[PDB]
Amino acid sequence: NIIIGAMTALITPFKNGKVDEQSYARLIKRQIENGIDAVVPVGTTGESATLTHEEHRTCIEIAVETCKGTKVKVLAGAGSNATHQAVGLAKFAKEHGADGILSVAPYYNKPTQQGLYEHYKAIAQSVDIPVLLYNVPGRTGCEISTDTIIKLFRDCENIYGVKEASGNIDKCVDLLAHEPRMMLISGEDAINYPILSNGGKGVISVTSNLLPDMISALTHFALDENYKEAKKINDELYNINKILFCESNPIPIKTAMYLAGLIESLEFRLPLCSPSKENFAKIEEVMKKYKIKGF
Amino acid sequence: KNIIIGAMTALITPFKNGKVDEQSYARLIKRQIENGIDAVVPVGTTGESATLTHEEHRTCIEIAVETCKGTKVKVLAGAGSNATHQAVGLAKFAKEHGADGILSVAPYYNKPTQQGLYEHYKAIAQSVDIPVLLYNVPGRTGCEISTDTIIKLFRDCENIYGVKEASGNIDKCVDLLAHEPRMMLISGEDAINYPILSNGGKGVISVTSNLLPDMISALTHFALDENYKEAKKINDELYNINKILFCESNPIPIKTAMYLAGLIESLEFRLPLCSPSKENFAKIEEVMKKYKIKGF
Ligand SMILES: N[C@@H](CCCC[NH3+])C(=O)O
Ligand SMILES: N[C@@H](CCCC[NH3+])C(=O)O
Ligand SMILES: [Mg+2]
Ligand SMILES: [Mg+2]
Ligand SMILES: [Mg+2]
Ligand SMILES: [Mg+2]
Ligand SMILES: [Mg+2]
Ligand SMILES: [Mg+2]
Ligand SMILES: [Mg+2]
């Protein structure tokens, strides 16, 4: 009971300071039509931190409704640094038809490994849908160790793998060498192919917001062990993959989506804001080397 | 600028049966007042700000204000958020409910740029007319307020008067006060309270003072009075407890020590925080034995 394949950490478009729900649905339809296997509403890339709890819930509902009647799954963002709120989001996602949840390691409060284990156990015990852990220490200030990930995978029936955003291919080897049944998911676009070629089973991508067909193809080639073709795409995408992090994600990806005419306004919620003019121009220049699908 | 400086405590938040123990909270604050503390910080990191509800966060600020009323002790209310709209809401609440100023941690998790940090804190500072202390703790937030950004905020915004630094970076503390000597640099790292004060820092926002308020207030007051020999003496004596209070993530050790000292009833955290390991529980207990812990 897993959610794998090519997946997108959806941006959240704003219009006049509110979630633009029509644009959100339209962007999801564009992901579906370009080979994406699942969408992740309200992850880091979707500005989870600055949505209200009601908006967070609305974006999950829009993703569920938009994916009905399709093969595309909804892996709902449900993380929180307070376990009671992470349980509440997990339950909401279950009750409102998500296929599974993503759940980021608690940020700012730096729980111990024992606390992370208890956090995730509480979340997994609250629902009967798949739970994907999400490790991104550069943002949270903590790491879910390999031992803790493996213990959670083995001890909790619905915890099925981890999204790694840690720049640590050693850890990816460690994870799958000791627990080959888990689903390791790339959370770092530039190294999608290395993670997949070591037996990772999907990506939760920032770049796919802009280039969903390319990330889709990369992932599906790799899962088929067509590594030459997957690597070729990974290699081709390196420049855009890296420029999308020239400032904190999702500042560059929303900039690119705006430059591509895919969102109406380059609008963030504070404390996120527009990139520098110089970075804005760098992103624009890198984009010229890629074919960007429209609607 | 109006300022809040001196010896300050990042209050722990005691829980009882899963709720804030409001009587214990007030009792702990009165104990801080009686041991020379200059201000208290309700609902900082040490107060488990992340896992209190917005209502509990507000109640703890109100208890601090009421308990300090009529004493000279100030309330520098924890008001940070990684969402600017919520940081503004907490700032306004603290202003409207009688806090003397606010602490406001740099946004965690979403990694704003320096421009975003500037706009975040400008919005906060413009929303109130009480002092605002920035708070940099990159190991927990994932971002750093640069020296340049702190100094610009200090110069551009009337209310922003300094920063609590929890960054292990005495070079930055020199940089800050060499280029902007008018700001109030506040130590947010107990083990290096004395180095920060001796370079012209003007107070501490302390974890250790929860347990040893008299020692931390004395350390700070000796230093402000330029008795560096005596401030260093206490800083040195406190190193072992200062370090053991971070053997696991703060506030796990300090709540453990407060419980071991009989100062709180229950060793209760909100998940994802939890009890320390049995080894670290014993280590904290052992280190505490070398210090004289004031009662109530
Ligand atoms: N700003 C808070 C609340 C987010 C609520 C919706 N995801 C946080 O980052 O945890
Ligand atoms: N857990 C959320 C909400 C805290 C609300 C009370 N301080 C955060 O850390 O931002
Ligand atoms: Mg809205
Ligand atoms: Mg999440
Ligand atoms: Mg790490
Ligand atoms: Mg890397
Ligand atoms: Mg095939
Ligand atoms: Mg091949
Ligand atoms: Mg704060």
Side-chain angles (χ1 to χ4, degrees), chain A residues 1-17 19-47 49-70 72-109 111-227 229-276 278-287 290 292-295, chain B residues 1-29 31-71 73-232 234-267 269-289 291 293-296:
Chain A
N1 290 239
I2 69 184
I3 300 167
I4 60 166
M7 320 181 236
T8 296
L10 300 169
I11 55 152
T12 305
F14 298 115
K15 186 194 271 198
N16 300 136
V19 175
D20 182 342
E21 301 178 20
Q22 293 64 39
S23 173
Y24 199 60
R26 198 177 184 198
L27 291 165
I28 292 168
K29 289 189 190 279
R30 176 173 172 272
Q31 295 290 313
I32 295 168
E33 290 172 7
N34 280 287
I36 290 290
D37 298 298
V39 294
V40 179
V42 195
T44 318
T45 304
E47 283 166 92
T50 59
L51 300 187
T52 66
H53 275 285
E54 200 173 63
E55 288 165 332
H56 190 143
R57 281 160 176 75
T58 293
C59 288
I60 291 169
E61 291 181 320
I62 291 166
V64 168
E65 182 72 21
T66 304
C67 292
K68 287 186 189 181
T70 78
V72 182
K73 294 185 178 173
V74 174
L75 181 74
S80 173
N81 59 349
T83 304
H84 186 78
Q85 293 304 317
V87 168
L89 282 160
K91 286 183 107 62
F92 177 91
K94 167 48 196 200
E95 295 174 11
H96 287 79
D99 295 288
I101 55 170
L102 188 67
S103 188
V104 72
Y107 37 89
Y108 185 55
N109 53 6
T112 64
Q113 296 304 299
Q114 177 68 32
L116 284 170
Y117 181 88
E118 290 183 41
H119 176 81
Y120 284 121
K121 179 163 176 264
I123 294 157
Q125 284 186 341
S126 78
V127 296
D128 63 355
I129 54 175
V131 175
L132 193 77
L133 314 176
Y134 171 23
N135 187 53
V136 53
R139 295 302 194 82
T140 62
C142 80
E143 174 99 343
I144 318 172
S145 76
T146 294
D147 282 337
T148 300
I149 292 163
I150 291 180
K151 283 186 184 182
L152 285 169
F153 175 84
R154 291 181 181 165
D155 296 352
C156 301
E157 104 176 286
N158 44 337
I159 294 179
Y160 76 95
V162 57
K163 174 183 176 193
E164 275 291 347
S166 52
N168 188 345
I169 202 73
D170 181 290
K171 184 184 191 192
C172 295
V173 174
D174 191 9
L175 284 164
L176 294 186
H178 292 100
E179 186 38 273
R181 301 172 292 171
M182 78 169 73
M183 300 303 144
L184 169 66
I185 302 301
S186 175
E188 277 183 323
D189 277 300
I191 65 169
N192 284 335
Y193 169 75
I195 288 175
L196 290 165
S197 72
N198 189 233
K201 288 300 176 196
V203 310
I204 286 166
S205 177
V206 172
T207 299
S208 60
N209 279 277
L210 187 69
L211 304 171
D213 57 320
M214 301 185 69
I215 289 287
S216 175
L218 187 169
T219 301
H220 293 138
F221 278 127
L223 288 173
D224 278 355
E225 292 186 275
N226 288 316
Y227 288 161
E229 291 91 344
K231 169 174 155 60
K232 184 174 179 296
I233 298 175
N234 199 73
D235 287 348
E236 299 182 341
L237 288 172
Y238 187 86
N239 285 342
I240 181 74
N241 286 339
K242 296 298 296 189
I243 209 71
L244 291 178
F245 283 76
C246 72
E247 298 191 11
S248 300
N249 176 56
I251 290 168
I253 185 55
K254 272 188 149 180
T255 298
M257 300 293 278
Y258 170 75
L259 279 162
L262 296 168
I263 58 180
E264 174 173 286
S265 182
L266 184 47
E267 272 194 50
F268 302 88
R269 286 229 174 125
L270 279 169
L272 295 189
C273 62
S274 284
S276 65
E278 287 90 10
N279 279 333
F280 182 102
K282 286 177 172 190
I283 292 163
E284 184 167 31
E285 215 49 39
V286 170
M287 290 171 67
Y290 301 86
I292 299 165
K293 296 282 164 153
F295 292 109
Chain B
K1 289 181 183 266
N2 291 318
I3 70 185
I4 300 172
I5 62 163
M8 318 186 235
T9 297
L11 301 167
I12 58 155
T13 302
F15 297 118
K16 190 187 181 161
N17 312 316
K19 296 273 303 158
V20 175
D21 183 339
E22 298 180 25
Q23 293 64 229
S24 178
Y25 200 66
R27 193 180 192 199
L28 292 170
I29 289 164
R31 173 175 177 275
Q32 297 291 313
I33 300 165
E34 300 198 57
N35 282 286
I37 290 283
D38 302 309
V40 297
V41 183
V43 197
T45 320
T46 306
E48 287 170 87
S49 63
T51 59
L52 302 187
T53 64
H54 272 289
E55 300 63 38
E56 288 165 332
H57 190 146
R58 286 166 172 70
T59 296
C60 283
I61 293 170
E62 298 171 307
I63 293 160
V65 173
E66 176 62 33
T67 304
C68 292
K69 181 184 157 178
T71 76
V73 173
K74 298 182 181 175
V75 175
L76 182 76
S81 176
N82 60 351
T84 306
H85 184 260
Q86 294 305 319
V88 168
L90 280 163
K92 291 173 67 85
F93 176 91
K95 205 299 182 279
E96 292 177 16
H97 292 264
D100 298 285
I102 57 172
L103 185 67
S104 188
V105 73
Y108 35 94
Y109 186 56
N110 50 5
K111 203 168 175 24
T113 64
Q114 296 306 303
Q115 177 69 33
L117 290 167
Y118 182 85
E119 293 184 34
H120 173 80
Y121 282 123
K122 186 166 170 203
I124 289 156
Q126 288 178 342
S127 73
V128 297
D129 59 359
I130 48 170
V132 174
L133 193 76
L134 309 180
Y135 171 23
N136 187 59
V137 54
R140 303 180 169 270
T141 64
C143 78
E144 168 94 359
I145 320 169
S146 74
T147 292
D148 279 343
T149 299
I150 294 161
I151 289 177
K152 279 165 123 168
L153 283 167
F154 175 89
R155 289 176 184 168
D156 293 354
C157 310
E158 167 64 39
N159 283 333
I160 293 179
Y161 74 96
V163 54
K164 170 186 175 190
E165 274 293 344
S167 49
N169 187 348
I170 203 66
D171 179 292
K172 188 182 182 190
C173 293
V174 175
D175 189 10
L176 283 163
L177 297 179
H179 293 102
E180 185 40 86
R182 299 170 295 180
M183 76 169 71
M184 302 300 141
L185 170 63
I186 303 298
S187 176
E189 192 171 335
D190 277 299
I192 61 160
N193 284 337
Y194 165 76
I196 289 179
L197 295 167
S198 72
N199 189 236
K202 288 295 171 193
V204 307
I205 283 163
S206 171
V207 177
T208 299
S209 64
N210 279 279
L211 184 72
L212 308 166
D214 55 317
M215 304 184 69
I216 291 286
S217 69
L219 188 167
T220 304
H221 296 143
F222 280 125
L224 292 178
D225 285 329
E226 299 181 31
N227 194 332
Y228 285 178
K229 184 185 159 61
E230 292 307 312
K232 167 173 160 59
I234 296 175
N235 200 69
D236 291 344
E237 303 178 299
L238 293 173
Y239 186 83
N240 286 341
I241 185 79
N242 286 341
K243 293 305 292 189
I244 210 69
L245 293 176
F246 288 77
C247 70
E248 302 194 8
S249 301
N250 176 57
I252 287 167
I254 183 62
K255 271 183 135 173
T256 300
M258 296 295 284
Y259 167 77
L260 285 165
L263 295 168
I264 65 180
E265 189 168 330
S266 184
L267 184 46
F269 298 90
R270 292 242 167 111
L271 279 171
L273 296 192
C274 62
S275 284
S277 66
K278 272 163 219 74
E279 319 76 276
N280 284 333
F281 187 97
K283 282 177 165 188
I284 291 157
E285 187 172 18
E286 190 54 41
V287 174
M288 287 165 69
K289 295 286 185 230
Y291 300 92
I293 300 163
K294 298 280 197 168
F296 291 109

